[PDB]
Scaffold this active site. Structure first.
Site, PDB file in Angstrom:
ATOM      1  N   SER A  41      39.268  37.594  37.499  1.00 43.77           N
ATOM      2  CA  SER A  41      38.511  37.299  36.188  1.00 43.77           C
ATOM      3  C   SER A  41      39.325  37.444  34.922  1.00 43.77           C
ATOM      4  CB  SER A  41      37.797  38.608  36.079  1.00 43.77           C
ATOM      5  OG  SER A  41      36.434  37.919  36.424  1.00 43.77           O
TER       6      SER A  41
ATOM      7  N   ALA B 182      39.211  39.723  39.950  1.00 35.51           N
ATOM      8  CA  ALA B 182      39.484  39.719  41.391  1.00 35.51           C
ATOM      9  C   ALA B 182      38.968  39.135  41.880  1.00 35.51           C
ATOM     10  CB  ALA B 182      38.542  41.323  41.386  1.00 35.51           C
TER      11      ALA B 182
ATOM     12  N   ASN C 168      41.625  43.737  47.006  1.00 42.19           N
ATOM     13  CA  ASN C 168      40.123  43.979  45.818  1.00 42.19           C
ATOM     14  C   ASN C 168      40.219  45.789  45.597  1.00 42.19           C
ATOM     15  OD1 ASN C 168      38.856  44.097  43.816  1.00 42.19           O
ATOM     16  ND2 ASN C 168      36.836  42.576  45.278  1.00 42.19           N
TER      17      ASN C 168
END
EC number: 3.5.2.6
Length: 352
Positions: free
Chosen positions: A61, A309, A334
């Site tokens: 993102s 992520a 992540n």
């Protein structure tokens, strides 16, 4: 790298890597405007390839910051207006719920409850039209914020339509090239695969899968050097020679909505600096928003940031314009967002 920077970075990240079992990580600290790089571990565990300053990580993102700046640039070029209806760039979107939904709502997740993910079943252009036509908002536009890939993703797609360029070409020519981000990609070329780290999810090596609006919402891959350059560009947009891009960067850091102590920009999110570290701190979080009428131009005393992520990667970028200070954390696991922000704050607070 001044020993002070060396020390806070190592004392903060070494333990993070240990606690979160991160395979590989790269960090850049921009201090007084200059970049300092750090790398640890593995880009590819099986082939024993180390993370280097040339390793490509999926930004997830954090790609939304690029989309927000590209959108800002199209506005500055006079190609689109955030006040325009969504239907102006997509006339086929005739369902009545779209009346009143503007490009600003899409860009800032305030359209009325667009979903976080575009369903996997959605692939073709006709599939996408059908998806948005069938969507039923939970709320009136501009009343609640719900973070969503299908929201800023559609914004990115519509924003480049007047230009006549595909989203990838627009991003390369208007953002990447001008800023000299020569190792930043929406699609990783074969020549660069030797540098593309694998992400790790439950110990398995993985790369992000193709999906609708993936380029626009979470598909950029980059190196710690190019991301350091991206942070410097956003810390000092006036040094940028391309006029509309300089303006676009500024529009993306403007404050359009407020929820709690946070402000929504285009891609970027901001809080007033100094910030309460715990204030910077769930699969779906609907929050009412207050409109900032008119939007506040980029505030130098801000903590500007974005988490990102993909299934196998975790990234974080944060900077404080008034202090010419910033940080980029790229990792091929992540791991929890709170852990990324805690580390960034620990490092930047020490240097401020």
């Amino acid at each position: 790298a001044p020993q002070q920077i060396n020390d806070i970075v190592h004392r903060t990240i070494t333990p993070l890597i240990e606690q979160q079992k991160i395979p590989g990580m790269a960090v850049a600290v921009i201090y007084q405007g200059k970049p300092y790089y750090f790398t640890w571990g593995y880009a590819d565990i099986a082939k024993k390839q180390p993370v280097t300053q040339q390793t490509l990580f999926e930004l997830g993102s954090v790609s939304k910051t690029f989309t927000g700046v590209l959108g800002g640039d199209a506005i500055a070029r006079g190609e689109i207006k955030l006040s325009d209806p969504t239907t102006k760039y997509w006339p086929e979107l005739t369902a009545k719920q779209w009346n009143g939904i503007t490009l600003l709502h899409l860009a800032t997740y305030t359209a009325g409850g667009l979903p976080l993910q575009v369903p996997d079943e959605v692939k073709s252009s006709s599939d996408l039209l059908r998806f948005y036509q069938n969507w039923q908002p939970a709320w009136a536009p501009g009343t609640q914020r719900l973070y969503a890939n299908s929201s800023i993703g559609l914004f990115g797609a519509l924003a480049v339509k007047p230009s006549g360029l595909s989203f990838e070409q627009a991003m390369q020519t208007r953002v990447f090239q001008p800023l000299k981000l020569n190792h930043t990609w929406i699609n990783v070329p074969p020549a660069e695969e030797k540098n593309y780290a694998w992400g790790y999810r439950e110990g398995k090596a993985v790369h992000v899968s193709p999906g609708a609006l993936d380029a626009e919402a979470y598909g950029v891959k980059s190196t710690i050097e190019d991301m350091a350059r991206w942070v410097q560009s956003n810390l000092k947009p006036l040094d940028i020679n391309e006029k509309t891009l300089q303006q676009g960067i500024q529009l993306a850091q403007s404050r359009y909505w407020q929820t709690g102590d946070m402000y929504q920009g285009l891609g970027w999110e901001m809080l007033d600096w100094p910030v309460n570290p715990d204030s910077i701190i769930i699969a779906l979080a609907a929050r009412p928003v207050k409109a900032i009428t008119p939007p506040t131009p980029a505030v130098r005393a801000s903590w500007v940031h974005k988490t990102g992520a993909t299934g196998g990667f975790g990234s974080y970028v944060a900077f404080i314009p008034e202090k010419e200070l910033g940080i980029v954390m790229l990792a091929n696991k992540n791991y929890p967002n709170p852990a990324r922000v805690d580390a960034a704050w620990q490092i930047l607070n020490a240097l401020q």
